[model samples]
Target chain A: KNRALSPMVSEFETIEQENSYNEWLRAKVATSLADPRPAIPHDEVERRMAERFAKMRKER
Target chain B: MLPVLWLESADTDLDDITSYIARFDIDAAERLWQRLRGCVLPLSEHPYLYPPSDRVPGLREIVAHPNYIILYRVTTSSVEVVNVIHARRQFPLEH
Candidate 1:
């Protein structure tokens, strides 16, 4: 199967959902570098988070 | 207004930074978010700037304002603002 949209988005949401969400993302980033295969590249990750920023901006 | 909350930097000097963000007051939060974006987005793409610290894994810096504490952590990917939460609360409690 492996049809996961992108681990980054889910990871983003995971952090967003928690009080330590920011810490969670950092852990994930470290997790990604430690195990690059399971994680999307940094650029893609940034792209998705940037989308969050844009959304936040629009809401403003 | 409550006194300013400063996230003290730890041993690694991983350069932990903090700032207050007013909650539901989306205007201030968004402004902080944009500044955060400026700090992080470039770090995501550019290696030479805001490099990661091998010693410290990472941690979020919190600053409080009206029902919210800004969340963030530093890592190889970027300085991420993981959560925006109420002042009187605990997190990683859900989701």
Candidate 2:
């Protein structure tokens, strides 16, 4: 049958699970903003991201 | 330059996805975060490159990943990211 849930689909068993994740995320962001840190420069964001991805590629 | 700015909701969306993916693989989580922003940051100068989304008025989207889309809007001085959403989810229509 084509009805079986794939691993990704099974990540959230119901709408509640998905909603809960979103709600948690919203709260986390709000908390961070309340204690707002200095913004990371765009180039730094890019460089850090590139290094992270390069490490992932190497791991694979 | 139309510098990019993320609305709080969009920040939450990105955080949610990153946290979820991190539960399985931290590296993949970081990679996804990079890709999402990669689609976003370049819009500071090329804000008109992506087309307006039919589902959301006045907003545009970039395909960040097969499962995720980055929704944004162009203002006079900036590119505002409104949401980062999963393709299968019921995206809020009122944005």
Candidate 3:
């Protein structure tokens, strides 16, 4: 799970590949926007992250 | 309200990234961290703000900043944040 990614993740060789990737990315976002479920509020996320960070920092 | 959850592996991403950069430039590491963490805030209000991943069926990528991305998935119970990774790196391979 922690393998280095430099070798695996690489840039596209041709413009066409890049273009296709961009198009695919656009469609992916579009699909997400269509989701009707409610999201967690910003405040809650902020609080949780703050709490989580505290836990992480304790170990450092 | 729906909750935001972070996986253990995902939480470690921030530490690994920040800690590595801290050796070179502590301030840059801190600032980069601020931006990286800030990226996930949007998902709370817009769980589907980012696009669903093509590689990972249920996950989505929040294109934060120039290339840093926060991976997440919208679930019935919550928005599960999976990871924060750089575009230069290979994301999780198919499970």
Candidate 4:
């Protein structure tokens, strides 16, 4: 894995590898959206982000 | 001073990334969201730090995280984040 992207657990030394991973990520999200699971609620996404920022502020 | 603004497309990308990751791991999704914000929020002050985008004219990009890039354009008073996507995604044919 590309050590630089270890935080995201990714490695890509070549453009092709990066392209493949991108394609896979797009496909993964597409498939999940197609599933019967109710789409993730919108508020949850916003809330999570807000929480992250709040934590960042608290730590600072 | 330039303010950073996220266009609708970039907002949608964030929503997609968050929801997709949240399905598996909420904490991971939150971290990714934080990383993305960390990448873009600074554009308000240093949008020029990112190199010009080869695929999109008048655009610049920074690798926000391992998998994603934040693409933006600098304007008179603000920096507009046009899109966020996996770094390997096919470049747009035209802006």
* Per-residue lDDT of model 3, residues A1-60, tens digit only: 223334335454444555555555444434444545544454554565566556555664
If ranked by TM-score, best first, what sequence of candidates would result? 2, 4, 3, 1
Q: Comparing 1 and 3 by lDDT, which wins?
A: 3
Per-candidate TM vs. native?
0.29, 0.60, 0.58, 0.60
The residue-by-residue lDDT of candidate 2 on A1-60, one tens digit each, is: 124445576545566655655564344334444544443444554565466456545753
Best candidate (score: lDDT): 2
* lDDT for each residue of candidate 1 in B1-95, tens digit (9 for 90 to 100): 11111122110011112222233454554555445445444433442343233323443434433434444454453444443443333422322
> Which structure is stronger by lDDT: 2 or 3?
2
TM-score of the second chain, each candidate in turn, equals 0.33, 0.90, 0.83, 0.87
- How many angstroms is residue B74 displaced in model 3 relative to the true structure, after the best TM-score fit? 0.8
Better of 2 and 3 by TM-score: 2
Candidate 1: where is the Cα deviation over 4 Å? A1-60, B1-24, B54-93
Question: What are the DockQ scores of the candidates, in order?
Answer: 0.04, 0.09, 0.08, 0.06
For model 4, the docking class works out as incorrect
Give the residue spans of candidate 2 off by over 4 A: A1-60, B90-95
lDDT of each: 0.38, 0.64, 0.60, 0.62
Return the lDDT, model 2, position A38.
41
**lDDT tens digits by residue: candidate 4, B1-95:** 67776655456677666766666777787788778778777776786989986555567778888667877778786776666676654432112
